[PDB]
Amino acid sequence: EDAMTVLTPLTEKDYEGLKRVLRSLQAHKMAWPFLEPVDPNDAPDYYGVIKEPMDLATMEERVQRRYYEKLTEFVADMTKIFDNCRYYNPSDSPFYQCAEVLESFFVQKLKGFKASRSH
Ligand SMILES: Cn1ncc(Nc2ccc3c(c2)CNCC3)c(Cl)c1=O
Numbered sequence: 001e002d003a004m005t006v007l008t009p010l011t012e013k014d015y016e017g018l019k020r021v022l023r024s025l026q027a028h029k030m031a032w033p034f035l036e037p038v039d040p041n042d043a044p045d046y047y048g049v050i051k052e053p054m055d056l057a058t059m060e061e062r063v064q065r066r067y068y069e070k071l072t073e074f075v076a077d078m079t080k081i082f083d084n085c086r087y088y089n090p091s092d093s094p095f096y097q098c099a100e101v102l103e104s105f106f107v108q109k110l111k112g113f114k115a116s117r118s119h
Pocket residue numbers: 032033034036037038039042043046084085088089095
């Protein structure tokens with residue numbers, strides 16, 4: 001990651017962009033498995049093996065509460081959603097495929113955010 005992503009404190013202006021990114025993910029057709037926490041009754045041993053669960057509703061609360069101090073922390077929470085999903089699920093799972101497409105979409109939106117920060 002670039003130094004600005006690691007080191008530059010997030011401003012209120014930055015948080016308008018973070019909310020835009022999050023809303024774009026929540027609206028994506030393939031974000032449906034990630035909107036709310038994994039239901040334990042759908043996924044045996046999930047909370048036994050996934051030590052740091054994450055979901056977009058939890059990130060929405062953190063964005064609202066100004067939890068993130070650096071962009072790298074926001075990216076880390078987002079990356080947890082996808083990494084957890086690919087850890088638990090087989091590569092032919094619909095969940096795994098959602099993580100693959102949504103992560104690519106996140107990286108596109110993230111690159112746009114970082115550039116808007118530079119100007
Ligand atoms: C193993 N597993 N199972 C499920 C799941 N997402 C999911 C799927 C459906 C629903 C919710 C979450 C929450 N709200 C209810 C419906 C992931 Cl992302 C996963 O990895």
